[PDB]
């Protein structure tokens, strides 16, 4: 029973870690979207030039 308890607590905190990862990843994704949009507009300008 005590071993079961140990594993349960560890697994729960690990799930929280996974959520930490999803958070950081999504922030990076958000920033990269704007990078992409700017690059698209830059290609448009280069076309005009």
């Amino acid at each position: 029973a005590n071993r079961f308890t140990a594993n349960i607590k560890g697994l729960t905190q690990a799930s929280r870690n996974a959520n930490d990862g999803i958070s950081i990843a999504q922030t990076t994704e958000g920033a990269l979207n704007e990078i992409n949009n700017n690059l698209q507009r830059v290609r448009e300008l280069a076309v005009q030039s």
Partner: protein
Amino acid sequence: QAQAQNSQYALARTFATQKVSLEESVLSQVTTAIQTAQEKIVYAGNGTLSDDD
């Protein structure tokens, strides 16, 4: 004579139980403490932590 032997072992069992229970208590709490330290270690594995946190 036989009765005397039996009585002495009654006393011995009394004191053995004393010590045994007293150990079990803190042992359970030791399990608790190990487990909490474990959980906060697993959080040290969090790959988003800043050095001050």
